[PDB]
Amino acid sequence: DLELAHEKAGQQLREAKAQAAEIVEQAKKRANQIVDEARDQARTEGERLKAQ
Amino acid sequence: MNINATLIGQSVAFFIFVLFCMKFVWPPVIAALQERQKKIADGLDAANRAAR
Numbered sequence: 001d002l003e004l005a006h007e008k009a010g011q012q013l014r015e016a017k018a019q020a021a022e023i024v025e026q027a028k029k030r031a032n033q034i035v036d037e038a039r040d041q042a043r044t045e046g047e048r049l050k051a052q
Numbered sequence: 053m054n055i056n057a058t059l060i061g062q063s064v065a066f067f068i069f070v071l072f073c074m075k076f077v078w079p080p081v082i083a084a085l086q087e088r089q090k091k092i093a094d095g096l097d098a099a100n101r102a103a104r
Contacts, residue, residue: 001099002098002101005103
């Protein structure tokens with residue numbers, strides 16, 4: 001029982017640490033998207049002010 | 053019937069059987085008795101550690 005408890009405990013903690021890293025990578029994809037959209041928005045806005 | 057004889061003989065014979073039991077018989081039996089209690093105590097404690 002003690003060995004089985006340690007195997008199940010260790011295995012589920014692997015899943016949790018793997019899932020935690022996957023959550024952070026998706027946040028990095030989102031973070032790159034929102035600064036890319038801002039950098040392209042800023043490019044169109046500076047074009048508007050120069051034409052004005 | 054009552055005649056006083058063999059009183060010292062039985063008195064000495066009793067001490068011989070008492071000290072023999074004290075040295076040889078008594079200690080090994082208590083050690084073996086305690087080992088079962090210790091093994092069961094470790095087993096019940098280990099089952100609690102597994103849940104904890």
